[PDB]
Design a protein around this motif. Structure first.
Motif, PDB file in Angstrom:
ATOM      1  N   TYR A 132       0.822  -1.210   0.000  1.00 56.00           N
ATOM      2  CA  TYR A 132       0.000   0.000   0.000  1.00 56.00           C
ATOM      3  C   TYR A 132       0.862   1.270   0.000  1.00 56.00           C
ATOM      4  O   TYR A 132       0.585   2.200  -0.759  1.00 56.00           O
ATOM      5  CB  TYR A 132      -1.019   0.017   1.143  1.00 56.00           C
ATOM      6  CG  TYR A 132      -2.010   1.161   1.013  1.00 56.00           C
ATOM      7  CD1 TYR A 132      -1.903   2.302   1.812  1.00 56.00           C
ATOM      8  CD2 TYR A 132      -3.033   1.118   0.058  1.00 56.00           C
ATOM      9  CE1 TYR A 132      -2.794   3.361   1.674  1.00 56.00           C
ATOM     10  CE2 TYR A 132      -3.931   2.170  -0.081  1.00 56.00           C
ATOM     11  CZ  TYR A 132      -3.807   3.285   0.725  1.00 56.00           C
ATOM     12  OH  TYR A 132      -4.704   4.325   0.584  1.00 56.00           O
ATOM     13  N   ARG A 133       1.911   1.291   0.827  1.00 54.41           N
ATOM     14  CA  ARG A 133       2.874   2.407   0.856  1.00 54.41           C
ATOM     15  C   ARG A 133       3.525   2.628  -0.493  1.00 54.41           C
ATOM     16  O   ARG A 133       3.816   3.760  -0.874  1.00 54.41           O
ATOM     17  CB  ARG A 133       4.011   2.143   1.852  1.00 54.41           C
ATOM     18  CG  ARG A 133       3.609   2.018   3.284  1.00 54.41           C
ATOM     19  CD  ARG A 133       3.141   3.334   3.868  1.00 54.41           C
ATOM     20  NE  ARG A 133       3.012   3.172   5.306  1.00 54.41           N
ATOM     21  CZ  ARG A 133       2.116   3.784   6.067  1.00 54.41           C
ATOM     22  NH1 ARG A 133       1.234   4.623   5.537  1.00 54.41           N
ATOM     23  NH2 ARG A 133       2.105   3.541   7.367  1.00 54.41           N
ATOM     24  N   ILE A 134       3.770   1.527  -1.196  1.00 56.57           N
ATOM     25  CA  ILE A 134       4.537   1.552  -2.430  1.00 56.57           C
ATOM     26  C   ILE A 134       3.683   1.948  -3.640  1.00 56.57           C
ATOM     27  O   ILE A 134       4.046   2.867  -4.374  1.00 56.57           O
ATOM     28  CB  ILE A 134       5.315   0.217  -2.639  1.00 56.57           C
ATOM     29  CG1 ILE A 134       6.435   0.101  -1.590  1.00 56.57           C
ATOM     30  CG2 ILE A 134       5.901   0.133  -4.051  1.00 56.57           C
ATOM     31  CD1 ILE A 134       7.007  -1.302  -1.399  1.00 56.57           C
ATOM     32  N   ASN A 135       2.544   1.285  -3.835  1.00 55.61           N
ATOM     33  CA  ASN A 135       1.732   1.534  -5.041  1.00 55.61           C
ATOM     34  C   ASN A 135       0.234   1.747  -4.816  1.00 55.61           C
ATOM     35  O   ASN A 135      -0.517   1.931  -5.771  1.00 55.61           O
ATOM     36  CB  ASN A 135       1.987   0.453  -6.109  1.00 55.61           C
ATOM     37  CG  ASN A 135       1.703  -0.961  -5.608  1.00 55.61           C
ATOM     38  OD1 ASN A 135       2.349  -1.915  -6.034  1.00 55.61           O
ATOM     39  ND2 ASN A 135       0.731  -1.100  -4.723  1.00 55.61           N
ATOM     40  N   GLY A 136      -0.192   1.713  -3.556  1.00 56.77           N
ATOM     41  CA  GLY A 136      -1.593   1.953  -3.198  1.00 56.77           C
ATOM     42  C   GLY A 136      -2.567   0.821  -3.495  1.00 56.77           C
ATOM     43  O   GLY A 136      -3.777   1.042  -3.523  1.00 56.77           O
ATOM     44  N   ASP A 137      -2.047  -0.389  -3.696  1.00 60.31           N
ATOM     45  CA  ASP A 137      -2.866  -1.558  -4.051  1.00 60.31           C
ATOM     46  C   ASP A 137      -4.054  -1.752  -3.102  1.00 60.31           C
ATOM     47  O   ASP A 137      -3.873  -1.864  -1.886  1.00 60.31           O
ATOM     48  CB  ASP A 137      -2.006  -2.821  -4.090  1.00 60.31           C
ATOM     49  CG  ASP A 137      -2.744  -4.012  -4.663  1.00 60.31           C
ATOM     50  OD1 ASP A 137      -2.864  -4.103  -5.907  1.00 60.31           O
ATOM     51  OD2 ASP A 137      -3.195  -4.861  -3.869  1.00 60.31           O
ATOM     52  N   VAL A 138      -5.259  -1.789  -3.668  1.00 60.00           N
ATOM     53  CA  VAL A 138      -6.490  -1.835  -2.868  1.00 60.00           C
ATOM     54  C   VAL A 138      -6.703  -3.155  -2.128  1.00 60.00           C
ATOM     55  O   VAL A 138      -7.319  -3.173  -1.065  1.00 60.00           O
ATOM     56  CB  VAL A 138      -7.769  -1.445  -3.684  1.00 60.00           C
ATOM     57  CG1 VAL A 138      -7.680   0.004  -4.168  1.00 60.00           C
ATOM     58  CG2 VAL A 138      -8.006  -2.404  -4.856  1.00 60.00           C
ATOM     59  N   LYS A 139      -6.197  -4.254  -2.684  1.00 59.61           N
ATOM     60  CA  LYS A 139      -6.290  -5.549  -2.008  1.00 59.61           C
ATOM     61  C   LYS A 139      -5.306  -5.639  -0.840  1.00 59.61           C
ATOM     62  O   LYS A 139      -5.580  -6.305   0.163  1.00 59.61           O
ATOM     63  CB  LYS A 139      -6.090  -6.702  -2.989  1.00 59.61           C
ATOM     64  CG  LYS A 139      -7.288  -6.921  -3.903  1.00 59.61           C
ATOM     65  CD  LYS A 139      -7.341  -8.342  -4.441  1.00 59.61           C
ATOM     66  CE  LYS A 139      -8.632  -8.595  -5.216  1.00 59.61           C
ATOM     67  NZ  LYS A 139      -9.837  -8.583  -4.335  1.00 59.61           N
ATOM     68  N   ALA A 140      -4.168  -4.963  -0.980  1.00 58.78           N
ATOM     69  CA  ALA A 140      -3.202  -4.866   0.108  1.00 58.78           C
ATOM     70  C   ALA A 140      -3.814  -4.109   1.287  1.00 58.78           C
ATOM     71  O   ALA A 140      -3.720  -4.564   2.425  1.00 58.78           O
ATOM     72  CB  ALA A 140      -1.918  -4.202  -0.366  1.00 58.78           C
ATOM     73  N   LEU A 141      -4.461  -2.976   0.998  1.00 57.99           N
ATOM     74  CA  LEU A 141      -5.184  -2.198   2.008  1.00 57.99           C
ATOM     75  C   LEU A 141      -6.280  -3.032   2.668  1.00 57.99           C
ATOM     76  O   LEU A 141      -6.407  -3.042   3.892  1.00 57.99           O
ATOM     77  CB  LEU A 141      -5.783  -0.926   1.395  1.00 57.99           C
ATOM     78  CG  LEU A 141      -6.555   0.035   2.313  1.00 57.99           C
ATOM     79  CD1 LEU A 141      -5.626   0.802   3.249  1.00 57.99           C
ATOM     80  CD2 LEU A 141      -7.397   1.010   1.492  1.00 57.99           C
ATOM     81  N   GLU A 142      -7.056  -3.737   1.845  1.00 55.87           N
ATOM     82  CA  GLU A 142      -8.135  -4.601   2.326  1.00 55.87           C
ATOM     83  C   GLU A 142      -7.628  -5.612   3.352  1.00 55.87           C
ATOM     84  O   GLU A 142      -8.232  -5.778   4.414  1.00 55.87           O
ATOM     85  CB  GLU A 142      -8.793  -5.329   1.148  1.00 55.87           C
ATOM     86  CG  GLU A 142     -10.051  -6.099   1.514  1.00 55.87           C
ATOM     87  CD  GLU A 142     -10.515  -7.028   0.403  1.00 55.87           C
ATOM     88  OE1 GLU A 142     -11.129  -8.067   0.723  1.00 55.87           O
ATOM     89  OE2 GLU A 142     -10.252  -6.727  -0.783  1.00 55.87           O
ATOM     90  N   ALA A 143      -6.514  -6.274   3.038  1.00 53.00           N
ATOM     91  CA  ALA A 143      -5.919  -7.262   3.943  1.00 53.00           C
ATOM     92  C   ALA A 143      -5.449  -6.637   5.256  1.00 53.00           C
ATOM     93  O   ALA A 143      -5.658  -7.208   6.326  1.00 53.00           O
ATOM     94  CB  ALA A 143      -4.775  -7.992   3.258  1.00 53.00           C
TER      95      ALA A 143
END
Length: 376
Positions: free
Chosen positions: A127-138
């Motif tokens: 999330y810090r790196i590219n803002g990935d929404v599934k990363a945030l979700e987890a």
């Protein structure tokens, strides 16, 4: 809001740090290169799976996503990606992220004490790196598992809650994090600045919880990694709380650590041991302390008489890790960093490489080399 008073030892023989040569760009760059070579070899070794917490005769075994340590492997991949921007690393690490989202969705082998360690270097990292929404979700789902719910490594675990507060604006995440910081600080650090370490028994029946055992040599001893969890967990929490008391507590715990380092400035596995003891080192503790010192020095006032000593101390420790403790055998399954101790009393990963040690070593290198945006 108050932290109990602790004894802040003055730093003894500070010239043992101040006379060290600062690590150069070339030195840190080559240390990063050497780590990444092993990492790329290990990519073909682990595939979509993970290293075990520790090595066996300095070779990792391969396991699924069911330990407390899996996030540190993904963390190594993200750190490598910070350095070389290789989309290969992004690809593999994101696949780990999807496996972590699966893990939180199905509640596979989850202990609330481990959630920060599992999801920060893996999912919050992306999330810090590219803002990935599934990363945030987890990460938010892990934060929620932690909310439903005292050891010193909770100072690292609560960083997950501060992140959740920042992303949601929900003050309840912050409330629990802040409460837990003071609960841990006032209960898990001794008035002499050493971390408390105990065999934990049920407060109502006196039953022990197996098959885990105690960490640290004894009730009277100073477990090195526990000391490091404090050295790093305090400044991490300080970012979010800005209680000047936290700086004093850091000084207490750090100075205690520094005063008990041996000739090569790399901590023995318990700080009651030094040169001549015949005891194994725990490099992982020293790697973690470097990160914590580096973090605190972002905020520590220029007028602190010991700021320069801390700067040279972290350089001294990291230099020693690079020169004497980093892996030189580029074989499949080798760690980045040798001579850690996982669990002395259990006989697990004693004088072995471990994955959090590898992670914090690489984190220190990256911290020194670039302006690194924290996963934590």
């Amino acid at each position: 809001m108050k932290i109990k008073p602790v004894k802040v030892e003055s730093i003894e023989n500070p010239k043992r740090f101040l006379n060290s040569r600062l690590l150069t760009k070339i030195e840190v760059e080559e240390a990063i290169e050497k780590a990444l070579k092993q990492l790329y070899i290990n990519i073909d070794y682990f595939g979509e799976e993970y290293p075990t917490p520790a090595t066996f005769n300095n070779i990792y075994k391969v396991m699924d996503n069911t330990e407390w340590t899996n996030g540190f492997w993904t963390g190594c991949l993200w750190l490598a990606y910070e350095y070389n921007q290789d989309k290969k690393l992004k690809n593999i690490a994101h696949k780990n992220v999807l496996s972590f989202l699966n893990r939180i969705n199905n509640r596979i082998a989850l202990d609330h004490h481990d959630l920060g360690f599992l999801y920060t270097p893996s999912c919050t990292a992306e999330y810090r790196i590219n803002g990935d929404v599934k990363a945030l979700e987890a990460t938010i789902k892990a934060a929620d598992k932690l909310m439903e719910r005292l050891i010193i490594d909770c100072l690292l675990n609560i960083q997950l809650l501060f992140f959740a507060y920042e992303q949601t604006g929900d003050e309840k995440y912050r409330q629990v994090a802040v409460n837990h910081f003071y609960a841990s600080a006032n209960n898990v650090v001794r008035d002499d600045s050493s971390a408390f370490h105990t065999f934990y028994f049920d407060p109502e029946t006196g039953e022990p919880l197996k098959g885990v055992t105690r960490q640290g040599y004894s009730d009277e001893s100073s477990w090195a990694r526990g000391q490091a969890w404090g050295i790093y967990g305090i400044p991490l929490s300080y970012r979010k709380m800005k209680d000047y008391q936290q700086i004093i507590l850091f000084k207490g715990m750090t100075n205690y650590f520094l005063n008990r380092l041996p000739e090569d400035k790399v901590s023995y596995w318990d700080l009651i041991f030094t040169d001549g003891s015949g005891q194994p080192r725990d490099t992982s503790a020293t790697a973690t302390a470097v990160c914590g010192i580096h973090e605190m020095l972002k905020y520590l006032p220029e007028v602190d008489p010991d700021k320069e000593t801390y700067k040279y101390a972290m350089h001294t420790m990291l230099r020693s890790l690079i020169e004497q403790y980093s892996n030189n055998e580029l074989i499949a399954g080798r760690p980045l960093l040798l001579h850690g101790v996982y669990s002395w009393h259990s006989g697990k990963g004693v004088d072995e490489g471990n994955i959090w040690g590898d992670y914090y070593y690489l984190e220190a290198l990256i911290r020194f080399y670039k302006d690194w945006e924290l996963y934590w």
